Every structure is written in C-alpha cells, then in structure tokens.
Design a protein around this ligand. Structure first.
Ligand SMILES: [Mg+2]
Ligand SMILES: [Zn+2]
Ligand SMILES: [Zn+2]
Lengths: 1166, 89, 50, 99, 76
C-alpha cells in the first residue's frame, strides 16, 4: 500500500542543516531587488522583498496586472506577469531565496559557544574568524611539503611558501577558504586514524579528548549533515505577510525590521556582483565580502557582531533569531500566554445562596459569550429567519432571546479562573446561573481554593465549546468533583469564617440560660423550643436523639438514646446525614473539628452526601452567625489590669542592669543581652496575662453563687473558633506589641510598650514602619520566588504521568512515625495513609495476615493497623517503581480530589509540583531557600564528611593543607586514603572503627554523599524528611508522595562504571540502562551486563535533560538548542507534554492518553 | 443537572475514559443518528449520556458492538449495489 | 606597590594607556590623548559638579 | 468584559480587541498547567487551537457551534506554523516526518 | 589588534597603500595608454574585425540598425 504523499496527519518532526538545493526547493523565485512597493500604486515591485510573482497575489483570487480577476481562473499563471491567482493567504506561506556571490558563514554555527565549524574542523575560533576577515591565509590539503593541513600563514609566509611549493600545496582565505576546509574534510578517514591514535597512547589527557572527538565525528556522520552546509551559498527569504508593509492611519506605513535587514543583504550582494564584473581591486571586493558577511550575520542573528540599528531609529533592529526567541523568557508564545476567544472577566461578589456546583453569571456577559450558540438555537427553533436576522434579534436584545439563553446555559458549564493560578484548583468549572448585574457570584466555600478575597479581586470566565470540553468540565474541572486538596486528603471545601463563627456560636455551652436541664423528645422540638424564645440557643439539656451506624455490612444500624448536649447541638444534628455518630456535633465545633466532620462524612457516606452536607453547613453557618449578632467594640479588647505593673517591674530590671553597667560590673554586650531578655520576658508576661483575663473571666451565676467558664467575648470567640484572628494579633491588640529592629536587624532594647487599643506615639509608629515595609517587600518577593520554584519543578517533572497499572515490585520504603525527640511530631497513620503496602504485615503474632501485600490502605485498614500496635509498614513509593518512563498507579498512592486510587493517565508530576509550590508563599539555615537548596541538591557551605568505607581508621602524614586519613577495612585492601584538611576539628576516633556513612566530622551533609555512601532509600529519606521539616514547621500539609516523585526525577540519571555495551563514564538514563541490562542479562551476550552508579542531579539541572528539542527550545536558551540539535539531525518524536502543547495537538496525559497510546502502539507496528 | 458524576465513574473506572465514552454517546445523540436510552428531562446530550452511564446501559463495549452491527447493516443494503460493481473485472 | 604594577613611565606613556582604555582598538595620537584627557574631567564643557 | 468572536491580530493571528470589542482573556502557562493536572486534553487543545490561534479552526468551529454540533477539526495553530517559516528562513531545515 | 568592525579591517588595509606622487600619476596614466592601445592595435590587425564592421555598416544603411549602435562617433 502506498503510505501516502500529500497531507496526512504527521508525526514527529526533523531538524537539520539545509542544502543550497534544499533551500532552493522552498524558494519559488529569486528576489533580485531591494525595492518593495511602487510608491504610488502600492503594488509590489517585481521582483523584490514584496513581490506578487515570486510570492503571491495582493488580493484574493486576483492577478496583479488585473487581467484575470475571476475566481474561475485559478491555476492560471498570467501571461503578462506570472502570478497564479489563488488566495492571498499564500503570501504568508511561500518562501524565496537569494543567491549569494561569495560564500558566507552562518553566524549561528560560528558563534555558538562550542563553535560548530571550529570544533568540527578541530580549529580554534579566533583562527577561523581571523581567516574570515582576510587577515590571514589558512592551509587546506597541505599535501606533503613543509606544512600542516590546518596551519595558518601570513602574507609574506604565503608568498614564500608559494615560491617554494608551486602546486601540491594549497591555501585560501575568507569564507571560501573555510568552505574549502569543510568540503575537503573526510570524516571516515579521521574516524579510523583517531581510533588507532586512541588505542596507542596511554594518557588521560590524550584519550579523553580523542574519544570525545571521534564520538562527535561519528555522530555528525550519522546525521545527514555534511560540513560545507555550515557555509551559506543560498539565503532563504521569509514570506512577506510574515514581515508586512501594511498601511496605517494618516496614510502612514509601518513594517518589520527584517525588511531593512534583507534589503541591506540584497544591496550589498548585488553590489558585490557588480564589483566582480567591473574587475575591482582586491582591497575593495574584500571589503564588500566582509560587509556582506556582516549583513547576513545581522539578518540571521544580530548582536554577535556590530548590532546594526534600524532606519533613523537608534533601537537595534530585531532579527530572525530574535523573532524566534521572543522575550520575558524563556517564553515561546504557547508558554507565556495566548489570547483566547469565548471568554471574559470581571469583579467578583459573594452569592451565599448558591449551591457549590454553580456560580452567578451576569446576563450581558452570558449573552456576549454564548452568542453563536444563541444564534444557532434561535434559528434552530425558527424564531429567526436566518443567522443574519438572529444577530439583529440579539442586537435588539428582543424579549424572546433571554428564554433561549436560559436553554443554552442549563447543562453547559463555564470555567472560572483567578489571577495567581498555583495549584490545579485555580481553575474550577461551575454551572452558570443568570444574574442581573455586571459582577460574577462565586461560592464562598470555593473562596479557599482560589485564594480569592472579596476586596476587588477579578475572575475570568471561559466557555468549553466542544462537547468533549463540556464533559471534561463536568467530570473533571467541576467544583463538586474536587472537594479535597491534591496536596493532602484533607477537605479544601472547609467552611471559612462567618460560617464557622456561626456553627461555633451555635454549638458552645454557657453555664446557665433559658431551658437549662429540661428534656425534649428530639431535635425538632429543640429548634421549636429555641425559635419561640423559650429556650436559649445554648443551654445544657438532655435530649432523645436517634443516631445511625453503617457498621453492619454495607448496612445502616439505628440506635436512639438520651444525650447530654445543648439545644444548639441538637438543632444542628438535623443537618448531619445518616451514619455519622452524634459525637461529632456534641463538641464546641471549631474550624478544625468542623472540618473533620466533613472529612469523616466523605470517607463514610461518599461524595454526594458530603456535597449537600457542606452546602447545608454553610447555609446554617451564615444564618446562625447573623442571628448571633456578633460584633466588635472598643471594649471588646481587654487590656490586662496588671499590664502597667509588669511594665514597671520589667522597667526596674533595665535600671538595675544599667546601674551595673555604670559600675562596670557588667560589660556592654552582656548588658545588651540582659536588658533584651528582661523585656522579652515582660512581653510574654503581659501576653499570658491578657490571655487568661480575656479567656476565662466570664464569671457567671448558676443556682448557687458562682461558676466560671470560657468567655463569650466576641474577639475571643473569633480567634478561638478559627473564624479569624489569632493569639498573636489579639496580643498586639491588648497587650504590648513586640520588640522592633532597625534596618540592620539589631533588635531595639526598648520594645513598644503600647498597643493598638491604646494610641501609639510618634517614635513607636516610626519604628514599626521598618518592620511593615520589610514585611510587604519580603512577601511580594516570596511570591516571585514561589513562582520560580513551581516553574523549576514542573519543568523537572511534566511528562511523568501514570502509565502502567501495576509494575508489581515488592520494593518500597520503610514507613515509621517521625518520632522527633519529643513525642510524635507526625503520626505513622498520616504517613502510611492512602498508600499501598509493599508487603503483607504481621500481627505481633504471625502467620496472621491482617493486611495482604498490595492493598490500598484506606482509613479503615489504617485504623485496623492502629488497633493492633503495628509500628512499621513498608510502602511502595514512586521513587522505586519498576515501570519505565512514568509511574504505575499501583505504586503511586490513592491521593486525588477523589478518595479512590489514582487513575491511569493522570499526570502526577505536574500536580506534585503544583502541590509543593502553592503553599510556598506561606514559608518564612531554613525557610523557602532551604527548600530550593534541597531540591537543587546543592552541597552546603560547611559540610561534614562520611567514612568512605567501614573499618578501623587512623591519621597519617602532615599539615599540607590536608592531614590524610588512612582507612583500614578488615578483609579488603587498604588503599582508600582520603585527604582531610586538618584545620577543621574532626570527630572520628583515631583508635576506633567507623561504618561507611558515619560522622568523620559534624555539620550538614551533601545529599550526593548520602546517595553514594548510604544509598537511594537513604537519600530519598533525607530529602523528603528535610523539606517536610521546612513545611511542617510552618504548619503546611504536603504528602510525602509529591516530594517523592520530585526525588525520582532528581536521581533520573546514573553514570556507568563497568562495560559490555556502552561507554565508560557516560551519564545516562537509568530507565535506558536498566532496560538494556535487564534485556542484556539474557539473550545477547549470555550476560555482558553493565554496572552503573546512581547520580543525584538537582532539579534545575535535571530539567536540562530532555530528548525533545521543541521542549528544550521553550525554557532553555533557544538559540543554542536549535543549533545543537540541528547538527546532530535530532528527530523529535513529540511524546511529552510541552512539545504537544507547542505544536497544538492533544496532551499525552489526561483524556488524551487514550489517543496517544492508541497511536503510539499503532506506530512502530503493522 | 448532574451535580456529581461519581456513580458514572463507578460504572467504568478510569474517570477519563468515562469522559470519552460519554462524549461518543453524547455525539451519537447531538448530531442525530440516534435517540436517548433514558427519559430526556431537558438534560442536554452531555447529562443524558452521563445518566446513560450511571444506569449501565452505555459503555465502550456496548457502543462498539452497536457500531459493529451497523457496519453490517450497511453491508446488507449495499450487498447488491457493490456486487454490481464487478466492472472491476 | 601600585607603582610596581604600573606598566607606564612618563606622562605621555600614561596618556596613551588612558586613551587606549577609553577608545580602544584604534591607534593613539599625542594630540588625541591630551585632548581626550583634558576634555574628560578638566573641561568647562564636558564636566560640571555644579 | 466579555468576548465571543472579535477582531484578530495580523502578524500572528490571535484575538485582538481593536474596537473596544475586547481581546479575550490571556491563557498563560500556569493556566495551562492547571488544565494539565486535570485530565482535560480537549479543553486545552480547543483553548490554544480553535478558540485562538487556528485561522481555519476558529471559523470551522463557529459554524459547528451554530449548527448545533460540538466538535473541533483543529489542525495546526498559526504560531507554530509561523515558527517553522522563521526557523526555515535560516540555514536550518525543519521538516515534518512520516505520517 | 583587530577589533573587527570591518571599517577597521578596511581602514588599516588601505592605510598601507602609499599616496601617489604627482609624476607617478603620469607614470600610471602612460602605462594605461600603452596597455589599451595594445588591444586596440591587436583588434586593428584582425581581418574579421574589419569585415564585421563593414557588414555592420552595410546593415546600417540597409535600415537594419542605427548609426549610434555602431559608432560612437569617429574622430568627428
Ligand atoms: Mg486580596
Ligand atoms: Zn497579470
Ligand atoms: Zn510502581
């Protein structure tokens, strides 16, 4: 079967050097003229940069001369001036060329950092350029006389050598010379010779270089490029509509700078032809060749020579290289962004009446957005005669069409997005609800995920046009379908502030009120009791309730009892569906507990009940918060009655120490520390005074004289419930606020003795100012840093997607509680939850299999684990997965917005990166830079060293900057001898044995070491635990999984040690290697298998390694990537995400996985 | 509307392939070659398809079998038409 | 020591290095070195601290 | 602000408001990553092809939108198509292999 | 050295060439006269170079050409 010829749908792409003939293939004519347009009739001047004959008609299906104007005549080339009449779009397509008189270097291959022509010819750059400028003569094919082949002579030397050597000696100069070198070059001969030379001499200096060069040469052979190609004979011209001359207002014109450049090249070239035909002296024609080289170089990539300036304008003219590069990056225009139809934006407002599955959409906006749909529907029913008339109807805004829009809106979700998109939840899909007004209404419960306040934040809407986009929006991007953070299984739909103050005020108990101690049949008459004013919202009461438990087998058990609770809890219980116990609502319901309620509800009753539950919780929260009449007054903030006294005593301390300094008893510095310490203590005193007073000081009467309970004071309830405020800010409101520091960071020894409730004075405020500005600047900067980190992260991962289902390995990491120094800084439960057991675990007794090998440990399995005392669970990690080029779902974990195991095809690397990066603003050596350092694998500043090998050690030689440590293992040879600088204080015992990876000194260690001297599991544990230290210290929840996938990408590369297939020291993909040695262990050589060594590459480095050049050209240096790929003739197969986004085809993740896989298998097949 | 798709994800696993199958079916209905397998509530083809997934009367297998049958239905018609094309000889 | 690192000797010897520092690549001249140097910080035209 | 189908930019065909008829919302890299984390391929393809960069795709789509058929026949975005000419304008030959 | 910027690699290259002496201009000019006149005389000694001119003038008065496309004037 003929495969095909004309346009199929392509796969891969290929890049290479271009032939004079191949360049001529694209060219439909030679531009012989600098002229553009006629200057009156603006028609293109034939034949020039803008030409109808070479390129195309100026207007659709119309000849230039005007003879053939009819759409009937198409493939006709007009007799007058040949122009085939065809759409004017082709003027945006067709190429052309220019035949250069003298050969010309392609500046991309001359100035690329490892100069291509230069290291191909094994010639230095300066020599090559020197020759190019006609400043020296260079030998070519020297024959046997006196002279080296690449040797460079001068005027006198060339003349002398010529007088001696006649023929059988050859030298040229300028571009023609270099081209002669490249053309004369035989790669094959060099190959043979170099292999031999490699073989004979043993020196590292010789053979390293030798081997690198021969490999380079064979790589360039394999191609298909040949050397002469780096030198330009023919120069292609960019199609004119891509560098347009188009008119403006006032009759003015504006055009691309490429026309200036091309014009320059053409003029100088033609002038060179002239100077050749006029028989000009060498000095002149040479200058013309130099100028032409400069012109071509300026056209291709400007700035690697003189930086030509555009006409009359100082600003340097943009060149083709700059046309490719873009800027603000690192941004290739799919990357930075692209304008999109069917979309809009505006200020957002509240809309609490909404179910969380919908959003208020302004009438006008929805009208303008769904316009084509409205047209088509209108004429579908017949309300509009034709599409034209349908426009005129909606343009009239006739009364009918609103009813049609109600139809087109119903089942048809819209995408809402906010500005700082961090994690994937930054975009969510809702159902449009038509709303009067220009503002968008956004569900309160979602305000968390968006990080969207109501202070004038704006949101953007997008319409999912195609059917697949509607179903993708509804089954994936839908609001209700992500109720959980992808970072951690904890609910992101957790009620925020007003609502939690509502449920808190509802469920809390006072000591006494109306209805205290009575008895009621159930929640119904409890609410009925409250609403009529008889019983207080909160009063201690026994009521009969019926709870349910599903603890039968998939079946709900009913039970009823008398519960000691409050009227409020009783009323609220009406909302709690089915199987949940009454215990959950019987507490005080803080922002934390109110969340665990929802979480438990989800993991018990499923999605739908959790959704409707959450909705109800929000509604009742708002309503009862409004009923509550919560407020904030000036007397709501209570200053400790003991404050002034504390201030006084602490103030006496300073004067004690001051007198001591005047008496010389204490020095200056120690004194400073003392006074700073006394004030620092005073602050804690006032804080822990105001907190006692504020918290418990409601003293209230029940029956007998007195009792005291937690306060009903507003600001307290706010800070306590989790609504808003915190003990720090409350402390700053009532008690004195802090100690400040000068710009230096030297902390002022006179703290602010006044707070916000009292007035601050001039000094106190002026001193607070610096802290303020440093705060704003710092946070505004940490935004940028966070962004950078996420970027590095997704660049490092991306294409990692769940590919296979089960790789089926017993391998994994050993999961224990973190158990740090105190008790249990994080439990075993959270660490092992949602993960999959590597192997079947014991009871304390055995042949008892409680959990059998690979079973996703869901909450129940985990609680079974907790019932027994089990202290340890080996867990499959993404880092150890046997599957190549991705991760198997069975080894990943369950985690998702859904509680079920991860689906085949979801791209986990991206959401991992996003998950690590979203909280990144919250982080305050330590901090966010610590995280960056960890992921970059950077060796610390003053690191320790670990024993290279086990066995007894001892000290030898002396004081040469290093006092050597000689290691002595039991059985093995001694020879490992390391040189440790003696001016650092050691640890290791001169008379004792040390295991490999022991402390031979103190200080932080480089993870490279931890990988090498300890091992893979050790280093992944080190990374994950350290970054988790950074985050967890800040109260950030990030599952180990994501850091573990990042880690997997970090160690991706490994350097070979042994042999039998590939080269000795090559850094190479383990996936590649392991696949090749697993393939090698059988068949092939019976076993030739090659050893490797795992390598730790930092994220920014690991991102550098990519097979796809379309991808590399995105975030890397474009100019270098395209060259470096072009020489090798590198053929990009796509495969990964970035390239497919760039080329504008389906993502090979997601819904796309089905397609790409289906195609990928169809490829390399029958 | 269909507020949660969870039951649909229950029937066919992947949660993606669900979107795909539902898309195919919703297209069978939208460009009208076919009609619903479940009462139309004014639910658009999107949600009708999803409902059809929940009720287990629509998934990849079923659709494939149906299409494979229809190919042969058309073979039955053109049986006399294309055999008269023996002019290939 | 600064002097010990000084490649020059006399006034013009220094003026050459200064001129070749400011406008390098091109052949120095006596009148050129003097003109440039006197024009830099010493000219009422090209220099003012106010 | 809101837009369905407006004016387009000449140099690279992209949505451009010239009329106080607005250029649509810019869909950036992060916004793309968001679609990438979700399994939505088609939302993204239509986002960067038919809704924006594809000069055939936009209109061929629009007609289907009014016809009551939701599909896309995307083809190749004009940005990349331009980049091919820009790369090929140099001494670089970039081809589309196979089938 | 060479700062590139081809204005330099030109200026320095021509800067070698020595300014002509007044008499030297006459030397060169005389050399030119000798040189040209050689090819003029070698053309004169060619029989076909004569016959061709004859046939061409025969084409001029036969109205197949014009006097401006054959001679740019004689002396006169
Ligand atoms: Mg804000
Ligand atoms: Zn014509
Ligand atoms: Zn695995």
């Amino acid at each position: 079967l003929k495969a095909q010829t004309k346009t199929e749908e392509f796969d891969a792409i290929k890049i290479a050097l271009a032939s004079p003939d191949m360049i001529r293939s694209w060219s439909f004519g030679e531009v012989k003229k600098p002229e553009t347009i006629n200057y009156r009739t603006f028609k293109p001047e034939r034949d020039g940069l803008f030409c109808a004959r070479i390129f195309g008609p100026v207007k659709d299906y119309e000849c230039l001369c005007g003879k053939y104007k009819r759409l009937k005549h198409r493939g006709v080339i007009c007799e007058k001036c040949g122009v085939e009449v065809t759409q004017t779009k082709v003027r945006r397509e067709r190429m052309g060329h220019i035949e250069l008189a003298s050969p010309t270097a392609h500046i991309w291959f001359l100035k690329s950092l490892p100069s291509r022509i230069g290291l191909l010819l094994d010639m230095p750059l300066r020599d090559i350029e020197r020759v190019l400028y006609f400043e020296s003569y260079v030998v070519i094919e020297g024959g046997m006389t006196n002279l080296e082949r690449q040797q460079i002579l001068t005027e006198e030397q060339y003349l002398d050598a010529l007088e001696e050597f006649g023929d059988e000696f050859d030298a040229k100069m300028g571009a023609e010379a270099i081209q002669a070198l490249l053309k004369s070059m035989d790669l094959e001969q060099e190959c043979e010779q170099l292999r031999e030379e490699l073989n004979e001499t043993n020196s590292e200096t010789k053979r390293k270089k030798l081997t690198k060069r021969i490999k380079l040469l064979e790589a360039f052979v394999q191609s298909g490029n040949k050397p002469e190609w780096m030198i330009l004979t023919v120069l292609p011209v960019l199609p004119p509509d891509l560098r347009p001359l188009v008119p403006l207002d006032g009759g003015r014109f504006a055009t691309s700078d490429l026309n200036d450049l091309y014009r320059r090249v053409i003029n100088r070239n033609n002038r060179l032809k002239r100077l050749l035909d006029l028989a000009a002296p060498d000095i002149i024609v040479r200058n013309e060749k130099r100028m032409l080289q400069e012109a071509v170089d300026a056209l291709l990539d400007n700035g690697r020579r003189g930086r030509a300036i555009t006409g009359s304008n100082k600003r340097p003219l943009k060149s083709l290289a700059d046309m490719i590069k873009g800027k603000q990056g690192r941004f290739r225009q799919n990357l930075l962004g692209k304008r999109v139809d069917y979309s809009g934006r505006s200020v957002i407002t509240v809309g609490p009446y909404l179910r969380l599955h919908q959003c208020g959409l302004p009438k006008k906006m929805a009208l303008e957005l769904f316009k084509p749909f409205i047209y088509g529907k209108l004429e579908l029913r017949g309300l509009a005669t034709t599409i034209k008339a349908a426009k005129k109807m909606v343009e009239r805004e006739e009364a009918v069409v609103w009813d049609i829009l109600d139809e087109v809106i119903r089942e048809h979700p819209v995408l809402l997005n906010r500005a700082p998109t961090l994690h994937r939840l930054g975009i969510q899909a809702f159902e449009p609800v038509l709303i009067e007004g220009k503002a968008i209404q956004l569900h309160p419960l979602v305000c968390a995920a968006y990080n969207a306040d109501f202070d004038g934040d704006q949101m953007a809407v997008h319409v999912p046009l195609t059917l697949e986009a509607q179903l993708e929006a509804r089954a994936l991007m839908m609001s209700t379908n992500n109720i959980l953070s992808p970072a951690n299984g904890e609910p992101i739909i957790v009620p925020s502030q007003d609502v939690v103050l509502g449920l808190y005020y509802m469920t809390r108990d006072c000591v006494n009120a109306k209805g205290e101690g009575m008895v009621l049949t159930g929640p119904k008459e409890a609410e009925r009791l409250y609403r009529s004013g008889l019983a207080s919202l909160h009063a201690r009461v026994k009521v009969r309730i019926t709870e349910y438990e599903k603890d039968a087998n998939g079946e709900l058990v009913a039970k009823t009892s008398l519960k000691d609770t409050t009227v409020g809890r009783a009323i609220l219980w009406m909302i709690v569906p089915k199987g949940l116990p009454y215990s959950i609502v019987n507490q005080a319901l803080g922002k934390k507990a109110i969340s665990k309620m929802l979480n438990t509800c989800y993991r018990i009753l499923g999605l739908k009940p959790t959704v409707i539950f959450a909705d109800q919780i929000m509604y009742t929260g708002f309503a009862y918060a409004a009923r509550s009449g919560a407020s904030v007054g000036i007397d709501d903030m209570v200053i400790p009655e003991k404050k002034h006294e504390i201030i006084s005593e602490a103030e006496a301390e300073v004067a004690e120490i001051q007198e001591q300094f005047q008496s010389g008893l204490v020095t200056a510095g120690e004194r400073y520390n003392k006074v700073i310490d006394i004030w620092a203590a005073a602050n804690d005193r006032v804080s822990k005074a105001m907190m006692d007073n504020l918290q418990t000081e409601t003293v209230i009467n029940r029956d007998g004289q007195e009792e005291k309970q937690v306060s009903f004071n507003s600001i307290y309830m706010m800070a306590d419930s989790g609504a808003r405020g915190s003990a720090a800010q409350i402390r700053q409101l009532a008690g004195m606020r802090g100690l400040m520091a000068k710009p230096d960071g030297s902390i002022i020894e006179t703290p602010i003795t006044a707070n916000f409730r009292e007035g601050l004075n001039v000094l106190q405020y002026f001193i607070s100012t610096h802290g303020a500005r440093k705060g704003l600047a710092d946070t505004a900067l940490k935004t940028a840093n966070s962004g950078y980190l996420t970027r590095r992260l997704v660049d490092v991962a991306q294409d990692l997607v769940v590919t296979e289902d089960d790789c089926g390995t017993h391998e994994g990491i050993m999961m224990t509680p973190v158990i740090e120094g105190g008790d249990v800084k994080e439990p075993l439960r959270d660490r092992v939850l949602g993960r999959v057991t590597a192997e079947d675990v014991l009871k304390p007794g055995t042949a008892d299999i409680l959990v059998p090998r690979n079973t996703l440990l869901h909450e129940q399995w985990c609680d079974l684990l907790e019932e027994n005392s089990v202290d340890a669970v080996k867990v499959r990690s993404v880092v150890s997965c046997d599957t190549d080029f991705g991760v198997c779902a069975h080894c990943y974990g369950r985690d998702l917005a859904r509680g079920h195991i991860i689906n085949k095809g979801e791209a986990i690397g991206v959401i991992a990166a996003q998950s690590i990066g979203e909280p990144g603003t919250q982080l305050t050596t330590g901090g966010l830079p610590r995280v960056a350092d960890l992921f970059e694998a950077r060796r610390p500043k003053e690191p320790a060293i670990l024993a290279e090998i086990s066995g007894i050690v001892s000290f030898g030689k002396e004081t040469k900057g290093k006092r050597r440590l000689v290691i002595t293992p039991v059985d093995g040879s001694d020879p490992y001898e390391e040189m440790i600088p003696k001016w650092r204080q050691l640890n290791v015992f001169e008379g004792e044995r040390v295991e490999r990876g022991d402390v031979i000194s103190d200080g932080p260690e480089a993870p490279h070491d931890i990988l090498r001297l300890r091992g893979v599991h050790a280093v992944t544990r080190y990374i994950v635990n350290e970054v988790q230290d950074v985050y967890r210290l800040q109260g950030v929840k990030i599952n180990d999984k994501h850091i573990e996938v990042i880690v997997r990408q970090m160690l991706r590369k490994a350097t070979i040690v042994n042999a039998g297939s590939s080269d000795f020291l090559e850094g190479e993909q383990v996936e590649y290697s392991r696949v090749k040695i697993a393939n090698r262990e059988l068949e092939a050589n019976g076993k030739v298998g090659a050893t490797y060594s795992r390598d730790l590459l930092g994220i920014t480095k690991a991102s550098l390694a990519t097979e796809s050049f379309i991808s590399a050209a995105s975030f890397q240096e474009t100019t270098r990537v395209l060259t470096e790929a072009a020489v090798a003739g590198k053929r990009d197969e796509l495969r990964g995400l970035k390239e497919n986004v760039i080329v504008g085809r389906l993502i090979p993740a997601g819904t796309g996985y089905a397609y790409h896989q289906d195609r990928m298998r169809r490829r390399a097949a029958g | 509307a269909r507020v949660t798709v969870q039951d649909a994800v229950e029937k066919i696993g992947n949660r993606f392939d669900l979107v795909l199958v539902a898309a195919r079916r919703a297209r069978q209905m939208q460009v009208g070659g076919k009609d619903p397998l479940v009462p139309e509530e004014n639910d658009k083809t999107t949600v009708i398809a999803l409902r059809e997934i929940e009720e287990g009367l629509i998934n990849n297998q079923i659709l494939d079998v149906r299409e494979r049958q229809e190919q042969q239905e058309q073979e039955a018609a053109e049986l006399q038409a294309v055999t008269a094309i023996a002019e290939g000889r | 020591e600064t002097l010990r690192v000084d490649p020059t000797n006399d006034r013009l010897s220094a003026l050459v290095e200064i001129y070749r520092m400011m406008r390098p690549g091109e052949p120095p001249t006596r009148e050129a070195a003097e003109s440039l140097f006197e024009n830099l910080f010493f000219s009422e035209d090209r220099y003012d601290l106010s | 602000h809101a837009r369905s189908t407006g004016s387009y930019s000449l140099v690279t065909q992209q949505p451009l408001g010239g009329k106080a008829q607005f250029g649509g919302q810019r869909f950036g890299e992060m916004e793309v990553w968001a679609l990438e984390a979700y399994g939505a391929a088609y939302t993204l393809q239509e986002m960067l092809t038919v809704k924006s960069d594809d000069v055939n795709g936009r209109t061929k789509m629009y007609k289907n939108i009014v016809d009551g058929n939701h599909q896309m026949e995307p083809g190749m975005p004009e940005s990349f198509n331009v980049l091919l000419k820009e790369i090929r304008s140099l001494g670089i030959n970039i081809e589309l292999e196979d089938e | 050295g060479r700062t590139t910027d081809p204005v330099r690699m030109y200026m320095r290259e021509m800067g070698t060439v020595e300014l002509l002496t007044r008499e030297g201009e006459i030397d060169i000019a005389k050399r030119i006269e000798d040189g040209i006149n050689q090819v003029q005389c070698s053309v004169a000694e060619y029989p076909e170079a004569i016959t061709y001119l004859l046939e061409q003038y025969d084409r001029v008065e036969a109205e197949e050409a014009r006097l401006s496309d054959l001679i740019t004037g004689f002396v006169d």
